[PDB]
């Protein structure tokens, strides 16, 4: 998959495309409808399926540091796009271009001159051009006799509107199960494992993995979750009895760091039935279900007691998740008991 | 108007004065009664009308960093004093003098030796001398046969006590309309315009002006307000179609800056029907009425939609404010519609 | 009293001991039962009474910066231990030793090889060994025919379980009277006096003493308390009319410092009927009873008025405290009136 | 003078213009040669004289936070342009436009489509287009039969190249006299006066005005300088015996905060023979000549002794500056004697 | 390769081993002599080749935050050990164990009880036990009829001692060529690529990759270097015309943030003749030779001019590195011409 | 000794006094000449010997945060005054009083009305009144037939002027021996011992005591010094084989935190031939002579080697200090041999 930053980076010899346009944060089930529609048409006419997306978030251009939290990183947005059949992603920066353009010139410059599009696919909530003047209906009329337009209804399922907003709401509530249902996959984050408390191994109270994330990253509410930890493909040696590319059952503790930065987030993972230290590796953490709210501990005895209960409930939640094989990992480790 | 810092700075040849004493923060309608009384008497006897005020705030001397928020800056207190006819302001620093003085010596040193006062005007809540021992009644008896004393009742109107405390309460609640009613004018702040999001001009979502204020400055609660923006007199060039010394209709967004300083306040002004960038100018922002609480935005479409509604409600509120010509600006710009 | 950091520091020629083991934070009335039991047995057999305690807090080893607040400093834990008849304290660091040891090896290495113990005393909630596997019952069976074991019930009195947890709860609520009841003494902190507002002396609104404490120190909730201030023994000169080693009646204001560190705690003490400045001295502050919640002040008049009411209520609370001579200070200063 | 941010802000109404292009930082005597030629030609014909300038600095777009120090602020660059008869300034942001553009498209888009230029004036060092490809020669040949081009050699005078670089070098060395010679005026900074050491008045060692500047502001090397302080036009009252719009002789101390939130240069002004406090006013500080390097003081007698020597040297230096009228203030206060 | 944190993590199953002990920072050519001897002997017999190493650095246990800079990370030390045929690494924390131990108990506990060693290989400078008491000679005599001991002299080559100290000196001076000679490979760092100046692509002065390193990481002196950049194995899409696992010729700028939260060195890589943006990828940067010291730029034409000179020098230097095959990349991209 | 903050704290009861005036920072041998003369005269008559001193430093009132480093704290200045027989110290704050006062009003207000002085003793360099107008000669003539005045020349000894400046120079250079010669005692600092590297005990490279000082404290140049450490009188238990009120031979390492919240010098003390941990105690550290400059260590064997050399040099230096009794400790611990 090609990745182009700005209209100038797009190849001049691009001959034909089917294009979908949006922020696409989270690549949720509604987004997948737009992408599938685009990929299907591109196949039919022998063109490239192209995603036009935005970075920074369009809201951040107007309200710096008050944009919505990133459901995924830009890098994972690219990976997800590719996984659903996108051939090229054009990343637009509204501080550089296409902000003060009329709807008419937006279609002329982006869809025609740049992308040579014969088809465009957008959601019913699509807007474009200076001061948001263009709507999905504007697009239909401007494109008359120039390219075909598919405006897809926003996705409603089980009485819920599936949008980036609703996914962020679910994550903020700690309802990862609903977030996952809307995403069509387990919500996950990926990052390097750093040093934390002790070293991972025989001690149940030392995390197997410690990770930290910036304040722009959407994470579930502080608390403990059932999930799966995967060491991403690597030839680097691994301390302990975990193999790369296997999803290991884990109790995952999400927290925040007080006094200096009221939003520096940590993810501490306690891998079930394993003795390992993952310092230095890139690790994916998929969230499955909420186990409990955060609590303060008065003794090691109490801490370890609650730890063991988290493991018990995690084991039950994950055993059930496997049966929803569709979101479950292909290769996984989960013992029937300790 | 003369401004003296400390008793030592007062001219030795001062021959006669009528004096009022207090913090005078906000120069509200109650304060204006005291000042008017003082100016009237000074006129009658051919003396100077003098305000004795305090900086730092007397409370801050005892409780550093826990003094009440400044309704106005000291500089604006001076400007307001002058506007109501005060001929001289004596600024007293309680860390330097008059803190450990008996009520008797306070009158002897300040009113007589320093100010050569023939008349003094204070509120019913006036206190002075070491450990607040002197009251308004103490002042009356100490001044017997030495100078005349006018003790003015605290102002009650529409079931509300007008005090600096009540004004701060109204501002904290976002009730700028009540604050204004108590002040006898539009509550305002003034400051240099700095760079913010984008550049002011054609884009509706970029503020016309961005300003920042320190944590000691009383501002209305976070939210959006209807108000008037005035570029203070200047010969410096102005970017766009705003002229200096005209009050322009504006939607004003007051906010705070998270993580590092839970009280760094911003004021972002969106001037109605104008395309301008006010970087580098000193701008006055007068608040008229509350429009809405702060909210987070999920898209540019939503942001601009709410922006347009703020403009609509601001236009209605300001059209009404003009009819209260008494607080309304003398020279103003407000279009009937977009 | 000997203080040993780590098993290696214990003398090899130690011949016999009676040992009690625990965090002992606060040395509350339940802790005193264990210590008294240990000291009594050591006397009976002519052995040393030894306390095995832990620093850092065992919880902090697993959850750095999320351990419970220190009811006392380690230094005061030592002083309290000594006051109840302990002959030696062994301080164990779980990052160095005894964390990954089996219950069996824990008894062999610590109690036998290191301490040559003939008797051990623990609470019913005692746990030890890797992953908290050892309990009080484990200890009884492991020690069969090797040393005698006394497991003491946790202390319940007036429907309250006396534990470090319950004491911290009372302090957090500002219920110093209940905290004191559980501790068997006045809760106190000690530290050097630094510069604050003004200088202590004739001015009622300037504290006699200003102290600051780190975020790991348990202090009562923000507010005003009745208490006793003692200048610890010193030959350094004292500014004003306070003598060392006398408990002076005081109104004590506990506060926190906003914006940078949402937990930097201050203790400002206003000593009744005294004019003094305690800069540079080490001062003990004992808390007796809650007087009022924190409030913001709008004027010096109001501040001093509330100050005087605090003094009045403090005088009444302390006059009553003296009658509970058992917790009251041996040498004290408290005037019948101002 | 009009100020336009970006090409889209420029009136489509624009019929004809004489244009000059450059960073123009400092608007030094070399820059004035370019501006003079443009204004003359514009006056010759019926054309607007337009300056195209750049913000942020083009170097900072490549190397963020490694751009040269600003000899003046952008606001002062506008002020200076207007003073030399420029009718409009177009401010280009290279992160928005004219960056990836080739030399050929640059001339078409900027000079023809946007500015409708009949004449261009650029320096011999002028560069444009992608990867700095376009040059002075490339401009004469691109504009063939479209715009008359005037390329002006870089100014050499007294064996010294007058450039922004050269001016920054002089300032960095503390050689303000040479900087002024190159600039064609006294180097100056402007800004609000804040609270500092004590209050301005009768005491000599307390500044008349205290100002602080961010670290992007070019200032002379730390030290003491002879200069002029002017209170900018205002109707606000002035504490002391100074009036607005008069240049007062001052000894100016430039310093740096050893380590206070990084950044932050200080300018402290001691106005000769005046007793005033300029808190809250905007003041202009013009630098005439270096007096001495920074030094540390061990006593008050020593500090004041050197202070007195600073005033004596300043009187002499400022007398010569008035004698060398060309650069001196048109309306000034300078006593020959103390 | 196995990685064990502490002696208790080592399998009790371990029957036989050839062991080498040291900090092994950098795993330079002297270290490789020790490792080679251990691996050969292990291969000779039926034994595991084990490295005992130390984290944190033994100096930091005595002098926190005053330890030498890490030539490599601990993760890379593991990677290097594995590449030289080490079968297990035992990581010792001297704050946990083997610190107070005498030389005699060290050999019994570490080499016999834990590792069951038949052979030991140590440097002539090797020290162990309490207060650095044990030495190379003490090891040969302690292991009598237990373990065969091979003491290897410190490596001297070309009149230079090859040590971690010597390597750090070379790096600090910017002499990466000498560092590489001592290391037996190109010195490198690895890390995720982040957002930096603009986006990587057609523009030459914007880096292909931006990386930041903490202040514990040894890096070459600030300046420009010729090197190779490799995208580490990944299935993630790449923006631009670069492929993973190929070493691309690059000009590498090493810098320091003047004062940004302390710490933080930057490595900015400009890949020759490629237009790419490596945001989100893990990349390895190998340093071959010094090109120039840091310099400040006053114009874009000047910056790009020097940039072009940097590329020319880099081409020449990297051509020679490929000619000196031994150290060059096995699969690389380098154009002879621009 | 009495301590009075400000003239208003001085008893109105005061009938007669011999007074000396000065900053008295360090209370060096020149200061002792002034104090001795005052105490003798007070003893001669029936008068109190009074020191008038200044806090904050008079330089800091003019130049905040640019005052000289404190040779001692104000608390230690009180301690030293008392030790030389001063009966009262009056502390003057020049931001409160005696600043704007003329020389004539200074003598009337301070020496007559407040202190009722029959005798004054000042240095030849003495200055007072507004703008440093009053001098030594002006004092003899102002006090005519009121107070007998004794002006004492500044102390020159061994060709060196003994002044606070001279003492600070010696300290800054690391020449503590010369500083001690000028002071008439060992230069010292006092403060609480905190947690540092490991715990004090059997290990040689871990300090017996760790202390930190703010940046206003004069300390010797970074490096290693021979000195004496004394635990100040206490009934608190001591960990290890040290007793209070005995001066123990120590090697003292003075350092600076490279960049940790700014400020913060460290003093780490290694007590010879003792195994102790002084956490929580107040300790006095006396400096006798410089041993070596700071150096970085690359190994533990190297660190301990230099540590051992430091102890050897310290033994020799402290043996000579005991031989030069005059300055040595009256009760000390120093072994001739390790």
Curated annotation (Swiss-Prot), chains A, B, C, D, E, F:
Its cofactor is a divalent metal cation. It comes from the Bacteria. It catalyses: riboflavin + ATP = FMN + ADP + H(+); FMN + ATP + H(+) = FAD + diphosphate. InterPro entries: FAD_synthase, Riboflavin_kinase, Riboflavin_kinase_bac, Riboflavin_kinase_bac/euk, Riboflavin_kinase_dom_sf, Rossmann-like_a/b/a_fold. SMART domains: Flavokinase. Keywords: ATP-binding, FAD, Flavoprotein, FMN, Kinase, Multifunctional enzyme, Nucleotide-binding, Nucleotidyltransferase, Transferase. One of its GO terms (molecular function) is riboflavin kinase activity. Its EC number is 2.7.1.26, 2.7.7.2. Higher divalent cation concentrations lead to decrease in the turnover of riboflavin and the 5'-phosphotransferase activity, while the adenylyltransferase activity increases. Pathway: Cofactor biosynthesis; FAD biosynthesis; FAD from FMN: step 1/1; Cofactor biosynthesis; FMN biosynthesis; FMN from riboflavin (ATP route): step 1/1. The keyword Kinase applies. With magnesium ions the highest turnover of riboflavin is observed between pH 6 and 7.5, while that of FAD is between 7.0 and 9.0. With zinc ions a steady increase in riboflavin turnover is observed between pH 4.5 and 10, while FAD is the major product at pH 7.0 and decreases rapidly above pH 8.0. GO terms for biological process: FAD biosynthetic process; FMN biosynthetic process; riboflavin biosynthetic process. Catalyzes the phosphorylation of riboflavin to FMN followed by the adenylation of FMN to FAD. Belongs to the RibF family. PANTHER family: RIBOFLAVIN KINASE (PTHR22749:SF6), RIBOFLAVIN KINASE/FMN ADENYLYLTRANSFERASE (PTHR22749). This is Bifunctional riboflavin kinase/FMN adenylyltransferase. It comes from Corynebacterium ammoniagenes (Brevibacterium ammoniagenes). The gene is ribF.
């Amino acid at each position: 998959m090609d990745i182009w930053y700005g209209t100038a980076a797009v190849p001049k010899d691009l001959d034909n495309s089917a294009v979908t346009i949006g922020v696409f944060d989270g690549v949720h089930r509604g987004h997948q409808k737009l992408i599938n529609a685009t990929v299907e048409k591109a196949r039919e006419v022998g063109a490239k399926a192209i995603m036009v997306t935005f970075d920074p978030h369009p809201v951040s251009v107007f309200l710096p540091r008050r944009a919505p939290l990133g459901i995924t990183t830009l890098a994972e947005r690219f990976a997800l796009a590719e996984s659903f059949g996108i051939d090229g992603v054009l990343v637009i920066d509204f501080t550089r271009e296409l902000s003060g353009t009329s709807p008419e010139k937006y279609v002329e410059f982006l869809l025609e001159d740049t992308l040579h599009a014969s088809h465009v696919v957008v959601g019913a909530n699509f807007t474009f051009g200076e001061n948001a003047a263009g709507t999905a209906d504007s697009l239909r009329q401007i494109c008359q006799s120039r390219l075909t337009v598919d405006v897809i209804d926003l996705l409603d399922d089980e009485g819920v509107r599936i949008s980036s907003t609703t996914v962020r709401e679910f994550l903020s509530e700690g309802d990862v199960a609903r977030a996952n249902w809307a995403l069509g996959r387990h919500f996950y984050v990926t990052g390097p494992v750093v040093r934390g408390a002790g070293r991972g191994g025989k001690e149940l109270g030392f995390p197997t993995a410690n990770q930290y994330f910036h304040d722009t990253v959407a994470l579930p509410a502080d608390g403990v979750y059932a999930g799966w930890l995967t060491i991403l493909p690597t030839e680097a040696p691994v301390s302990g009895n975990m193999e790369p590319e296997v999803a290991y059952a884990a109790a995952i503790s999400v927290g925040t760091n007080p006094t200096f930065g009221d939003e520096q987030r940590s993810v501490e993972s306690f891998v079930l039935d394993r003795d390992a230290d993952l310092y230095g590796h890139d690790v994916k953490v998929e969230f499955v279900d909420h186990v409990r709210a955060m609590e303060k501990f008065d003794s090691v005895e109490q801490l370890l007691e609650v730890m063991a209960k988290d493991v018990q409930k995690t084991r039950t939640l994950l055993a059930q998740d496997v049966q929803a094989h569709k979101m479950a990992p292909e290769t996984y480790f989960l013992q029937a008991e300790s």
